[PDB]
């Protein structure tokens, strides 16, 4: 009849329909612990609290849902703060509850407690809150969650003292909330999604990009129906390019990043249709270079700051994408009147070829292995049925060239933080997310940033994870390396270099597969073995270091 | 060709369309005044920044557009705190702009710096950021009241250094925006939009509660049409209550405090459609005493964590409140036939007669003039033309008991802030757009509230504006000294009498007309008066205290 | 046996010594207000929070004691925030206590709540803290109180929620700390103080700054014993200045600010020892023109940021002013081997009659009164009976020159914040203190900051205080209006005009006495006449805006 605070909080997240939690144990938050194992919840208990963070970004971007970080008091929760700004500036939606010190006995310089952490996490979450009565929980943690997943997504901390956790209350008198709250996100009035689809109409050269918030909706049928129906080449960033995947080929942009060349070919867009995809670092900022300034814009961001922030535009809807692109979709539908654009969805296509073609003639693994050799080989496994997590720098930077002619089922790169080693985690909770999908989690990362969380072996092997992580061995921290090179000189280098560890070495002391690899061939044959076991896997490549990607330059 | 920061500040705010600044001269911010000047932008400076942030509260409010408050650095913006805590919890769309310290000299003990006034107004901005370059500020500008504007409506503060203000760039080196954001907000899916629709015809006593949202895009048209076709008596909070003067008679509820009499009649309503309307202090929280328990319950609110907040909801829908009228308007007009609903809208209208006719039986002037009675005098001038502005507790709870049957232009009373003395700034901004718009406002305030900002009748006089403060004198905080007589006890009373002051003075002394009443007969004679000049005025009310409206007691 | 949380509140405060409280009246705080009445604890209500907070500074100031304001939830706080921001610059020692929203029903959108007040405080505080439970509240009170009262001396705000002041808990239980906190500060190191007094013999031309820590300890008559024996001339900032009127007449050096005249008679500082005495606005920043970069600079600060911040010094300790002066005072007690000093004694005192008999010739009342002739008014009637408070701009440059050649018991003027409107506030708690030690306070502000706080002359009447507040009326925002004139032009005057108002016929209004003078003989007679009576007085003088202050163009 009495039940504790955190039985609370774990009836509540059934509720709302959370099948898993990623954490590491605290006794702040033990309560949480305990009911999860008396309702079958599974809590991925991690080696690192940012770990457990990442993972639940991961498992949010990778399945499309909520993901739940379970923190403890005090270190937990600063360990957890890299993922909180993580998927504050990539816009995923991930409850992260933490521990704190007992409402009772505030101010006593006692454990793990005399930090604010509400304070520290309300300059990069959605809504930063501690609970402060035991009858509070369980919709406070629904509105939360409210919040998270509600358009743009984000973080939300939910603060709970271990007083207001390991509190009794009677379980008949406090009430359980739904998680109402539709599915359906609010589209643009008709007049606007007209005047949109007018300028759409009588454009010589249209694009469509999309962003995040188009894949946290993922509204795969309704896309291909807009798609199919006015015949738009479709561009994405990093986070929008899963929703590609669906697609037919010739309507296949790919990334935005190959907009570049588009303007010395005489080719650039005539009209820019950006859905979710924001103006900054992925989208070349306000400098015209990718989205013309010469070009009408037509933006849809749930975010009015958005609505050309960088750059003039043309029309400026603040809407649900998942919402526009069914209404866009359900116009279209009666339509049927829509001009050929072959011609530019060849071009598109031509321009993009062009481009691969021109990095594949100018590498060479005649010495040591090319990191675009090495990235070649994980595209001919990439489809559907699989989920690619890149990290490094270099390293994501060489894998971005071949990841806009495969369709993968998840593309989860770098966002606006870039913060080196949140990779690890990240493909940990999308291979979870992965298990239901049926589909197998690829983590590309950097022989620097894989020492971020390399503890995490462990957790795949005792979680039986069957995450395979590539590490693109340049002996050092590349592209850092590579900006003292040429913005300093040859000689001035320092602090970026590591040329000691057997990354493998230390896989295997942790129990998983470890492959060490110096050629395409070796490579090859390891990239197919790891795919071939349901095991944890790491394949540590030798890749030279000198050859530099079009994308660092620009 | 060189131009101030300041200039390029009023350029922005001039393509962004506002006309009318409020706020208080300080030469961190003299480059803005400098350049008003110029393009004969009238700048109501005030006697107090509190006032002319309010001012551009009652502005926003009363015009349905933006407010722009400009203060100084350090005691200016210190003194702006209140407004920006108001339109905070009220969703009103200010623009607050501020000067600091010269980023150069930074950390250099000088005048009007050494504070963080960003830090200070983030817990309660939608927006709150520090200008780093004089380059930035037309794009920044734009952005803020892209902010501010976007739903749900709220303030946003743009700091701006006298270092970057004073700074002169070429003109045609940075290009000032459009403000290039939809007027038209997002609406709801056409299936949520069905299934409340499909709830609304299957309901019994259907209700339909009004929010601050629905004020600030003013559907009305849409609104008229969408109640006209359904049959739906419609209820509102203090800020929805202007939206319900063009709907016809029968279909009007008044506020929405009227539903508390509701169930002891066994008329409790069986489905209530929120549009705007939060759960909290105007709803009556989470009790169940205005929107029931048992009722089916459909929230419109562009916050998700907004939906179902303290009870559980039939449908929660994140949209727009103005998209979603118009949306509803558009879908009711081509639709079936909707049942009758006259006996239920005859049942609405009589409670509410019941409720006012239950009061006016047990108010009696005897001995001295009874808040109701007062509160009738100004119902009979009250129309379209009129906007009506309360403060002043045990006041503006008795004002309310004749506002439902009555049809202002505009009702600006307490939100949740509930701070006595915001009504004189508050009035002050909303004459200024009365002015515009041809109508005439009317301040209702306590003789505690009015001292706050009582040198407001100078800006007044100065300004030629024909404001009309009534005073109603009960010579104490009266609700404060009703609470330590109800809780605590008869000889109790303590630091809540205010007995001395002629106010009526006060405003003669700057120049205004000042009355001094004490009956309907004498009260009704100065009000006419007063009314009939165009003239700022003073009515001071010697009003009984021992009255307990209704509304204090729930 | 069951006691409230406010009832703890002010049995805590009374252990501490608290003898007067400031603010006004909330529900939210009336057990706070009760628990004062049964205590016989008096709490002088005001018309405004701002005004209550300003008076909890100026009874501090001119106590030298602990100030304590009282706000109640939302509103209340949010109007003290420009007295904590005041404090928070000039150091000065308050409790903020403020009311909150209950803990239980948080997150309800409820009446007065919803507004982090602790966040708001955070970057103006030297601890801002929400109080979780009513068992902490006299330990919390204590610990508060202890961050206040030491060095450097600074508000706190203490957050209070409904609830927990409401709460009745056992009184046998909970235990009422003593204020167990050493009055003596810490002293430098016997080898600082040593080279600092080796310096010092060595001198040619030392010379003593005292800042406001100096006048927070008052250690008097340590501070004469040490200028007696060593007869080093001392200069102090405005908060400082009362701290010289115990001092031999040839020791005087006064303001700071004549110090500005030495470097062209040749006469720069050779040493200047800095006591409690920031480098910024007061000290002419790192300018040199007041502090010279030639000089040797030992300072003495709290605060080890402070210590040499703008200018390199020779030497930095950090300990007490108050303990300090007493250590400089004890081992120059038995030293009695100093230089005599006597013709660099005489030199300060030409030097600053030099600069007094400039401006006294170039003043002249002919046509207008002159603002130098009315400041000479004032300074007759200034001794250490007398605390003068000022505001205004114009009005306090002009009055700093006279300020320097009398002893006055208290002068408490602008701090950094600089803000305008202060000084009603600060004088009507200066004169609750100044009542204890049998003193007079005068106001002297401009027409403009006069208008922030004008109703505070009914707290003046009500509670009797005996206050005269001098109008200096120029007619307008005079500083910012010459800042107009003198930057911008001539005929680029805006917003700072204030051709309007009868501010003695408001104070008359509110029972106050209304001088109205405009002419040196008429103003002396009615400052006469208000100093005769034990009545709240206003005195509006007539005073020319043209004439230019040596303070203003430096
Ligand atoms: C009472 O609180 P407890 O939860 O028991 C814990 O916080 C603790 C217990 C006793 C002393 C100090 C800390 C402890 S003790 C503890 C286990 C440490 O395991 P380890 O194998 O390192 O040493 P040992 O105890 O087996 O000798 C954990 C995970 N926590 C929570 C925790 C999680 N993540 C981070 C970053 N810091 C933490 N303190
Ligand atoms: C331009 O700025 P840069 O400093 O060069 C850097 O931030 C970056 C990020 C994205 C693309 C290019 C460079 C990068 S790139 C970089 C090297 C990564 O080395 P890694 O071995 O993982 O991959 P690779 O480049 O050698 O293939 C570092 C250390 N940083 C700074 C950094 C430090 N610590 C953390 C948590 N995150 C970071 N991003
Ligand atoms: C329940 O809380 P209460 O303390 O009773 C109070 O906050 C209140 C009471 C009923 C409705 C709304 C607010 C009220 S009501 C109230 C008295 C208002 O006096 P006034 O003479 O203005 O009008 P009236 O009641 O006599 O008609 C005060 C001082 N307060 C606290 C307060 C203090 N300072 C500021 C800036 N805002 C405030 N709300
Ligand atoms: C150099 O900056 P300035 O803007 O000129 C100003 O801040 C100032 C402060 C100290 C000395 C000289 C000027 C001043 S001086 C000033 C005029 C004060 O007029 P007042 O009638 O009170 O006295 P006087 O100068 O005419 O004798 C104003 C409005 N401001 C800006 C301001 C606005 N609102 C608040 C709460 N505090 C402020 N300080
Ligand atoms: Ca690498
Ligand atoms: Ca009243
Ligand atoms: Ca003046």
């Not at 300028?199 to 999309?210: H, Q």
């Not at 979710?276 to 670092?281: C, D, E, S, V, Y």
């Not at 070829?353 to 675009?372: D, G, M, N, T, V």
Request: aromatic fraction near 6%.
């Amino acid at each position: 009849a009495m039940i504790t605070g955190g039985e609370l909080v774990v009836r509540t997240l059934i509720k709302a329909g959370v099948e898993h939690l990623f954490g590491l144990h605290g006794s702040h938050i033990d309560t949480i612990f305990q009911a999860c194992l008396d309702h079958d919840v599974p809590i991925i208990d991690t080696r690192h609290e940012a770990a457990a963070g990442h993972a639940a970004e991961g498992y949010a971007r990778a399945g499309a849902k909520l993901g739940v970080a379970l923190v403890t008091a005090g270190g937990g929760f600063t360990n957890a703060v890299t993922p909180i700004a993580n998927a504050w500036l990539d816009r995923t939606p991930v409850l992260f509850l933490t521990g704190s010190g007992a409402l009772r006995d505030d101010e006593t310089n006692t454990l793990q407690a005399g930090i604010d952490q509400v304070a520290m996490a309300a300059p990069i979450t959605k809504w930063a809150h501690r609970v402060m009565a035991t009858e509070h929980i369980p919709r406070l943690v629904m509105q939360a969650i409210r919040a998270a997943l509600s358009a743009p997504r984000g973080p939300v901390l939910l603060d709970l003292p271990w007083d207001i956790l390991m509190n009794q209350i009677d379980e008949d008198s406090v009430i359980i909330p739904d998680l109402v709250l539709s599915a359906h996100g609010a589209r643009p009035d008709p007049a606007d999604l007209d005047q949109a689809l007018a300028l759409l109409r009588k454009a010589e050269r249209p694009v469509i990009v999309l962003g995040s918030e188009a894949s946290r909706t993922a509204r795969k049928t309704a896309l291909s129906a807009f798609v199919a129906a006015t015949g738009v080449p479709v561009f994405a960033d990093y986070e929008g390019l899963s929703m590609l995947s669906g697609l037919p080929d010739a309507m296949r942009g790919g990334l935005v990043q190959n907009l570049y060349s588009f303007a010395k070919a005489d080719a650039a867009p005539d009209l820019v249709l950006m859905l979710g995809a924001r103006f900054g670092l992925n989208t070349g900022h306000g400098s015209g270079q990718l989205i013309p300034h010469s070009a009408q814009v037509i933006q849809v961001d749930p975010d009015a700051c958005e609505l050309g922030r960088l750059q003039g535009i043309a029309l400026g809807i603040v809407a649900d994408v998942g919402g526009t692109i069914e209404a866009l979709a359900q116009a279209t539908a009666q339509d049927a009147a829509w001009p050929d654009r072959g011609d530019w969805c060849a071009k598109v296509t031509d321009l993009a070829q062009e481009r691969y073609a021109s990095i594949a003639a100018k590498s060479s693994s005649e010495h040591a292995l090319h990191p675009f050799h090495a990235s070649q080989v994980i595209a001919k496994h990439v489809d559907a049925g699989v989920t690619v997590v890149a990290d490094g720098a270099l390293t994501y930077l060489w894998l971005s060239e071949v990841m806009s002619r495969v369709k993968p089922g998840g593309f989860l790169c770098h966002g606006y933080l870039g913060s080196m080693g949140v990779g690890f985690g990240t493909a940990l909770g999308a291979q979870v997310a992965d298990l239901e999908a049926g589909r197998r989690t690829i983590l590309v990362t950097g022989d620097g940033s894989v020492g971020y969380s390399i503890g995490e072996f462990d957790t795949l092997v005792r979680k039986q994870l069957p995450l395979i992580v590539i590490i693109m061995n340049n002996q050092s921290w590349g592209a850092t390396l590579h900006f003292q090179q040429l913005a300093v000189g040859p000689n001035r280098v320092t602090g970026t270099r590591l040329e000691n560890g057997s990354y493998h070495g230390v896989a295997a002391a942790f129990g998983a597969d470890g492959y060490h690899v110096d050629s395409v061939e070796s490579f090859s044959a390891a990239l197919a073995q790891a795919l071939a076991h349901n095991r944890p896997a790491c394949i540590n490549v030798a890749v030279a270091l000198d050859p530099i990607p079009p994308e660092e330059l620009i």
